[PDB]
Amino acid sequence: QVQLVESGGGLVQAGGSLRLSCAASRRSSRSWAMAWFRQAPGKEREFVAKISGDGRLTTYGDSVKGRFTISRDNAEYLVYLQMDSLKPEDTAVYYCAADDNYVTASWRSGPDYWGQGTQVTVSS
């Protein structure tokens, strides 16, 4: 069992950057792959980025590759998403998720645990 809380969302101008974080409640979170997805209302939830328990593996969705960076701090039990060069199509609710299986962490049906989300709105 893992519970997840996202912070850091809000309003940003296109071209700018924002940093999100996902806080896990327990030390054991380190054993889980963690992933960010996003969903705009009425659209399908979309994979954004994932990272292995030990931080050594990361994978990105094609539309954010080279603009976003996922990382994690297992001492504070946080996973971070650094978003650069934001575009209006990045506007969404951003969700962090945990999956004991790194490979299925990028698949909609993979993760076992989800946060409630944090809103990111890119104006332009």
Side-chain angles (χ1 to χ4, degrees), residues 20-22 34 36 51 70-73 77-81:
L20 302 190
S21 69
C22 176
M34 293 276 174
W36 286 99
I51 188 162
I70 186 173
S71 67
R72 76 189 293 161
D73 173 355
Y77 323 145
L78 295 176
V79 170
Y80 286 91
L81 185 77

Side-chain angles (χ1 to χ4, degrees), residues 19-88:
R19 176 189 69 195
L20 302 190
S21 69
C22 176
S25 68
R26 278 173 47 165
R27 204 186 125 282
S28 66
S29 56
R30 72 197 288 111
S31 299
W32 301 67
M34 293 276 174
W36 286 99
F37 281 76
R38 63 186 180 184
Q39 196 178 213
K43 314 289 184 156
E44 288 311 289
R45 190 167 289 192
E46 186 190 354
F47 173 73
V48 176
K50 68 180 164 180
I51 188 162
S52 57
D54 67 8
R56 291 178 68 199
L57 305 170
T58 59
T59 300
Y60 296 87
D62 183 47
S63 52
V64 307
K65 241 200 216 42
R67 298 192 294 120
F68 286 15
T69 304
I70 186 173
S71 67
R72 76 189 293 161
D73 173 355
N74 287 341
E76 203 57 43
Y77 323 145
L78 295 176
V79 170
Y80 286 91
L81 185 77
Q82 286 174 113
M83 296 182 289
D84 296 329
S85 306
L86 276 159
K87 303 187 197 285

